[PDB]
């Protein structure tokens, strides 16, 4: 019993770390999405300007 | 000990999926900035040209 409970506890905390890291990469993705946005608006607007 | 074995099993299965989640968004992270790297060049040839 002692063995099993110890293994479970360490695995659970390791999980907590796992999903925090997943969150963090997710904000990475979203902020990069936003920058991609900002460019794409800028360059279509400059197409209208030149035209 | 049974539920100690039993409960440990799922968290392992939950974890392995939790490590799987690392790859794809980070894989998306590899593929996110290439499109940045793709999109940045897009204006470059244009504005040297349309000038």
Largest interface: A-B, 27 and 28 residues
End-to-end distance of chain A, in Å? Answer: 75 Å
Q: Multimeric state of these chains?
A: part of a larger assembly
Nearest-angstrom radius of gyration of chain A?
A: 22 Å
How much β-strand is present in the residues of chain A? under 5%
Number of helices of chain A: 1
What form of chain A results from the Cα inertia axes? Answer: rod-shaped
**How would a crystallographer describe the biggest sheet of chain A?**
none
Give helix % range of chain A.
over 70%
Alpha-beta classification of chain A: mainly alpha
Number of strands of chain A: 0
Order of helices and strands of chain A: H
Set out the fold topology.
The structure is cut from a larger assembly and holds two copies of chain A (51 residues).
Chain A: H1 2-50
Description:
The PDB classes it as structural protein. Keywords: cell shape, intermediate filaments, coiled coil, assembly, structural protein. This is part of a larger assembly, with two copies of chain A (51 residues). With 51 residues, chain A is an all-alpha fold. In chain A, 96% of the residues lie in helices and 0% in strands. Chain A has one helix and no strands. The radius of gyration of chain A is 22 Å and the shape is rod-shaped.
